[PDB]
Amino acid sequence: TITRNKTSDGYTIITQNDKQIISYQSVDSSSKNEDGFTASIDARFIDDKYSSEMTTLINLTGFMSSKKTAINFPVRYSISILNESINENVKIVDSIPKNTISQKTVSNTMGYKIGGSIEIEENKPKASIESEYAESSTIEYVQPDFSTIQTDHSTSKASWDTKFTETTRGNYNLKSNNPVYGNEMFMYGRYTNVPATENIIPDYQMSKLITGGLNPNMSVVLTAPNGTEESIIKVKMERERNCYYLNWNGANWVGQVYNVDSHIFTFKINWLTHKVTAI
Amino acid sequence: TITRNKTSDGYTIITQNDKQIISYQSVDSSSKNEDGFTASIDARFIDDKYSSEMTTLINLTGFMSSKKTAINFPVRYSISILNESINENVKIVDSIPKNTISQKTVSNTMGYKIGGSIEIEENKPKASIESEYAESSTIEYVQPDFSTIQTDHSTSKASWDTKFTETTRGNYNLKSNNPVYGNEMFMYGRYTNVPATENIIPDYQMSKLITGGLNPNMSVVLTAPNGTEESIIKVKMERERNCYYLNWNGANWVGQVYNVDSHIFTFKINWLTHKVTAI
Amino acid sequence: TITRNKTSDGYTIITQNDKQIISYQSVDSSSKNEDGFTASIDARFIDDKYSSEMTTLINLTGFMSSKKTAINFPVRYSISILNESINENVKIVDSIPKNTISQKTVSNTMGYKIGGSIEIEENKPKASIESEYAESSTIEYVQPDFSTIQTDHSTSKASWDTKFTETTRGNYNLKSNNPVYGNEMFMYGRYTNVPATENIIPDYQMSKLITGGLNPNMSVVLTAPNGTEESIIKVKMERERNCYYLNWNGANWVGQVYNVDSHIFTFKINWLTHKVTAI
Amino acid sequence: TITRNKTSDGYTIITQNDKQIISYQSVDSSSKNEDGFTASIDARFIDDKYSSEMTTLINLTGFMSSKKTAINFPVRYSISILNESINENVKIVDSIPKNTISQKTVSNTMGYKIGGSIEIEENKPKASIESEYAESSTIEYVQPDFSTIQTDHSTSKASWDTKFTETTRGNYNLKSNNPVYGNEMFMYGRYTNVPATENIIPDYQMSKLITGGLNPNMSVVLTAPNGTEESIIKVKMERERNCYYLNWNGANWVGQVYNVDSHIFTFKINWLTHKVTAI
Amino acid sequence: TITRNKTSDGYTIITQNDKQIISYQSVDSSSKNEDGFTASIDARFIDDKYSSEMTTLINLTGFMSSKKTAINFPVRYSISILNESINENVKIVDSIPKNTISQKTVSNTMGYKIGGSIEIEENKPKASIESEYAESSTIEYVQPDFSTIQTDHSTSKASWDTKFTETTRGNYNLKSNNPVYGNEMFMYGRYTNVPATENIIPDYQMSKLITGGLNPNMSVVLTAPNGTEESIIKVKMERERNCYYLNWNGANWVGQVYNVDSHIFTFKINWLTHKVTAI
Amino acid sequence: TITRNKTSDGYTIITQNDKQIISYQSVDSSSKNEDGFTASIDARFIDDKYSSEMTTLINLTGFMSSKKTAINFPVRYSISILNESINENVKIVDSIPKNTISQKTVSNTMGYKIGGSIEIEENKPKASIESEYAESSTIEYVQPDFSTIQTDHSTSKASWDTKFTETTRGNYNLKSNNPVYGNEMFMYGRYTNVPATENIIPDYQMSKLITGGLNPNMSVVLTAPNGTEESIIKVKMERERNCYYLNWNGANWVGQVYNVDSHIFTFKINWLTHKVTAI
Amino acid sequence: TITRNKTSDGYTIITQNDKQIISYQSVDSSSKNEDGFTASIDARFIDDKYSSEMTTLINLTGFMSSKKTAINFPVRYSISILNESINENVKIVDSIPKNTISQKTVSNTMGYKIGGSIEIEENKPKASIESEYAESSTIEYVQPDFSTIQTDHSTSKASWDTKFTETTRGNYNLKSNNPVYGNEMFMYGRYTNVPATENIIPDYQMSKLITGGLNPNMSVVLTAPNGTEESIIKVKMERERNCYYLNWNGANWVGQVYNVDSHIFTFKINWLTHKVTAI
């Protein structure tokens, strides 16, 4: 699979190799500083001699910053990729993150005990017999701090999102309700008797994704028939947040839990020149 | 992919190989001894025949020393990388350290017990029946001594930082408060009755990052269109510290916890000559 | 990347390979027998066709012997590497040993129990109900016998040191104080009633680094602009020791814990001839 | 890196390869049957085109047999390698066995329990409340049966040794002392009432190194400037032993614990001819 | 490192490769059916262009069968290899099986408990306080069923042997002595009341090496100066056995424990012709 | 190590490679359906340029079916390979399955407890002190369901066999004897009160080797001097079985345990033609 | 091992490689929809230059569907492969699935406890001494849900089968019998008081092989002398099923457990043309 050529001047020889798979890579980035939204697209174009149609791989990356008495704290992120050239026969054949099935560990035990006691006192007998029976079981599983679920996949739209799950210490969630303390999420001490600002929980116990932004990684595969030259890609990003509130109720420290930011980014693809640009 | 040439004098043959990916590497360092701040930049330039634009990888390393009655002890470090040639279309497409999601291990068990005892004394019966029911659960997780969170990523600025977390022995933190002993961080004995200097805790129990400086490792990827010749990189470093205080309260040994150093370094990049220098 | 040549006499052919990275290695050693100090420097010179400046790797090794009623026993070692050609633009860009962050394992459990007992005697009832509640937690970590902390890194000086930590049996340290036995480090039996020399602890329980010397391993990277021919390297070594004392207090065996050796070694480097020598 | 030659007679072609690293190996052995001492030296000579000086690797192996009422039993071995050509600039740059730092596993737990019991008798109440608090910790480590410590390293002399540590069953050592049984090392039964010879402990429980000899493995690296032709190596071997004694004290079986063999071997090295011989 | 030659007839080309290390292998076996002794020697001859002397590797294998009221049962095996050409400068430089050092696992724990109970009866107080303290330790190790110890190594003789250790069930050994049952090795039931032959223990619980023979694997390295042509190797094999006896003592089943086979094999080696034969 | 040749017609070139080790493989099978005995021999012939004598590897495989109130059930299998050409200097140098040494895990623990209780009643003291001491040990090992022991190895005969060991549930064996239930091997229920045929144990609990036949794997190495042309191999197979019997004894279900099949197969080997056939 | 040829027209060169082992593969399938029986045969033909006879590998695969108050549920599957060309010297030398030997884990422990209590009341002593002794053991093993046993292997016939074993929850089997509940296999609740159809057990708890069909994997090796052209292979498949029945007995829910499908498939093999077809 080599092509060679000789020359008269100096007997120069120029050999070249004929390869099967050739890829090209281009990257593009864009940002909206007012919302703390940044997105990058990495595109790879694959030239294969045995394939019937053109293939482009569209990786996505970026940063969604998380913003931070009462404290505002995010609760949900959402990312969507839209194919806007459907009438040109450009199609979304695959998306990398997928849904999986969890595993649980189960154990069961059953036991029997029997005991006989003879007690000889001074010329006095006390015979006692005892019997016991027991059964138990154990369940084990593993719990992430955030959960990512693919929600849609079609010829034009792939949509993913993530949501708040639970705290590592105390196992509280957004729906808990203690009769006299309300919601004890992000509460240090019930009776510390210090200013509200000082009663909040140390930051390190909070998840990294609440203090700092999420870092997406998503990939989509596109194909097209021979000759296609242009394509538009739209990326939609949404963020939802809520607020936690803490106050006095007599001597008790009690709390309670009660907008949406979004932006659309556009990119243009050139298949013939192997180029990706912002638009 | 080889180019060969012959010569008349001695039939000398000079073969050369044509490769796809060629990299170049240059390093530069600088320091500010008065603050104990040192920074190094390692730059790699990548020449790829199939890529549409130039790529430079900018690794960063350095040393931030930690300085050390009352004892001063650091509490937070912060590093920021700034791209200052935005109007020339030089862009930050990627940053290596990222945010991750932790895992927790959860177990639950439930059990039942039943017991029957027959006690025959001298012509005296004593029948007793007992019943028990129990439930329990266990949570497991892993805790670092320091925590690093990425806080910003954009076209121009990437900012990281680290903060104090907790002690390995005693699990104290910066917000603890015992009613009669105050804060027991870095306290050997409550009643040792020795001079204040002697009551401090042995150094080895303290984290390495408090006794000795942090060693950063950060990487940033830059790209540019064809022909770009120059670029300015700014690196900002900040350190925050606080003080611990211990005194007598009658017979009790009690304690309490109550500036910011910074510097900006500048580097110049030459794309055409593959050079990095201080400035 | 091959250069070939033919000859008339016997048609002798001499082929040579053109390689990218070429390294050279030289080693040098020196000692001071009076103090039991020995040091060795291994230098590697790297010739790279794609690098902008010369690089030399300076590994360091050696032996610091530990010297050994009252017994003298070391407590701290310290090593420092000094670059003495700063005005010639020879710079220390990297040092291999670094500071790291430890990990802790944390577990928490909470449980509930309930029990009902019915006791039918001869026409006599005795109903009893019991209830229990419990909580606990466990912390795990790992402890070395000696600890090495990097204390300084700059353009000219890199300084490391090591210190005594604790005993494997008994978990004593240099600051412990029992009211009636004093310090029980290196004490076999409180009441053995044998001569002082015989009451010391068997040697094997002591750490290897106290009975025998430390074996350093340190590496430093140096770079220089084209044409540099000479460089001076200074290596400083210090050792600190203390004494343990044991005596009678009536029938009780009690103890207590109450100079500094140093030397500077010099080496000369020749970049052009790829040579390292003592000086 | 190939040299080729053609010939007229039969067109014979003789190709040779030019390699970078060439090693040579020679071995020599010697023994002293009266003391059960045997020693072997394996020497490797390295020819490197990029090294500034000659290097020889001197591995050492051998057998030191252990000799075996009262029973004689070894307690310490010692090996030393001496370089006797210091005035010719032949130097010991490295020795393979080194000192290492051990690891300990530490755990701590704290727990709380609370219990309330209500006991209704025939019109009689008996309310009881109980409370418990507990704390504990665990230490784990690993213990060899023999211990090897490097004791000296210098330009001329490297010295190692090994010593007896403890028994696998009973954890006795050379300094133990029971008031009425003395030392119970190597004692089967306190009251077996059989002849002294029969009361000794079965051999298999004893360590292999006491029943049979130690098998040393030691390596030393030597270097020299160009042109060196000869070198003398001295190997010193010492063995220390003691005796265990057992007798009657009324009905009790009691015991107690109360020379040095050595030899020097000589070897001659020839650098130019790559030869090692006894001398 | 290739030698090539051309020919006129048909332009036949015969290329040969010049290799550095060439080995030759020959095997020989012999047996003595009357004693169930079989031995095999595998010899490998190594031709190395960079070595100063000839080397031969002498592996050994074979079968020693174990022979089997009163039952005869082996207790010790012994193998020895003798070099009988010492005056020709043929020497034993190495032997493969060696002595090793075992490892033990040690743990220690200490705990404290405290408990307070308040008991309010009908106008009657019963205050009780309890306190507990505990300490414990654990030792772990691993035990083979047979043990192999190298006992001698010299210029002429290498001698190994193996001995009986203990039973897997019951942990008995050759020196145990129960006052009323004697030795309970190989005894099924104390009171089974069946004929002596029937009271023996099932065979599977016995070690494989007692029911069936040992399979030795031993290796010895020999070297010689240039020109050596012949060598004699002697292999000595010994086996020791004892007897177990069982009888009635009233109603109790009691037992007690109270020649040597050997043979010498001879082999002849031819260095020049690379041959091994029986003799 | 290549031989090449050119030709005039079409310039045809025929290259051949000269290799060191060449093997040949032939297989043969035979059966005796009346006894359910099948045997296969796989023979490999090795041609080595550096070996002094010819080598043949004789693998063996086959099937021995197991045959199946009173139930017949096998108890022992035995396989023997016989070399019948001893007078032609054809010898058995090696046999693959061998005897091995097992491992046991041993642990020991010792602990001390002490407790002091103070009980203040209404003006009544009850001081109690308690003390405890405990010791324990644990033994672990692994148990196969069948056991294979090599029993003989010589110049002419290699003999192996396998025997019944124990049940996975209940740990019974062939020598157990309960006073009132006899042998409880293969008994479902003592009082099920169903026909004898129905009281047998479900088949799955029985070992696979009793329900279905054993699958042997044995290998033997033969060597011979140059020129040998023929060899006879005899394979002997034996199987032993016994019977289990169950009956009523009043209301109790009791049991008790109270020929030999064999065949010889013959094979012929041709060394010169590399052939194996039945005979 | 290459054959090359040149040509005049365009100097075309056609090189071919001579390989040692060449394989051919053909597959064939067939089904009987009325019984849900499907079978596939994959045949591989091996041409080896060093083998004395032809070899064909016959893999087998397929699907046997399982069919599903009273519920019919399978209980046994059986597969048999028949060689029908015995008189042509076509022979079955090997079959891949085989019988194996299981492993059990056994542990034993023995312990001793001793306790002394002193109780000083108001001028009243109560000395109590207690003693305890205990022994225990543990057995571990692993249990599949279905079991496959090879039952026959001969020159013409290889027969395998599988059978029902036990339930994962409750450990019931086909022979269990509770006096008042009968067989509790596939029974949800004893007193649920819902229609019979509703009391059956949820499907997921049942084994996959009962709800869905078995997927066989079997392989057989055939050999033949040179020149063989045709061969017939017969595959026999059988399935056995039974029924479970449940009804009322007063207030109790009780149950009890009380045809055979088969088919023969035929395939034809062509050795010379390397073809497999249905017949």
Residue numbers in the entry:
A (entry chain E), B (entry chain F), C (entry chain G), D (entry chain H), E (entry chain A), F (entry chain B), ...: 8 to 286
Question: What does the primary publication say about this deposited structure?
Answer:
CPB is secreted by C. perfringens type C strains and is essential in the pathogenesis of a lethal necrotic enteritis in many animal species and humans (Uzal et al, 2014). Based on sequence homology between mature CPB and other bacterial toxins, the toxin is a member of the hemolysin‐like family of β‐PFTs. Recently, we determined the molecular basis for the specificity of CPB toward endothelial and leukocytic cells by showing that PECAM‐1/CD31, an endothelial and leukocytic adhesion molecule, serves as its cellular receptor (Bruggisser et al, 2020; Tarek et al, 2021). The cryo‐EM analysis of CPB clearly showed that like other members of the hemolysin‐like family, the CPB protomer is composed of a cap, a rim, and a stem domain (Johnstone et al, 2021).
In the present study, we describe the cryo‐electron microscopy (EM) structure of CPB in SMA discs, which likely represents the membrane‐inserted pore form, at near atomic resolution. Further refinement and postprocessing resulted in an electron density map at an estimated 3.8 Å resolution (and EV2E and F). This allowed us to unambiguously build a model for the CPB octameric pore except for two loops in the rim domain (Glu76–Ser89, Ala283–Pro287), 4N‐terminal amino acids and several amino acids with unresolved side chains. Overall, the CPB octamer forms a 123 Å‐long ring‐like structure with a widest outer diameter of 97 Å. While the N‐terminus of Hla is located inside the cap domain and wraps the vestibule‐exposed surface of the adjacent protomer, the CPB N‐terminus protrudes from the cap as a short hairpin, which assembles to form a 16‐strand β‐barrel. We termed it the N‐terminal β‐barrel protrusion (NBP). The narrowest points have a ~ 6 Å mean radius and are located within the NBP at the level of the positively charged Arg11 and Lys13. The wide cap vestibule features a balanced amount of positive and negative charges, while the transmembrane β‐barrel is overall negatively charged, especially due to Glu152 and Glu162.
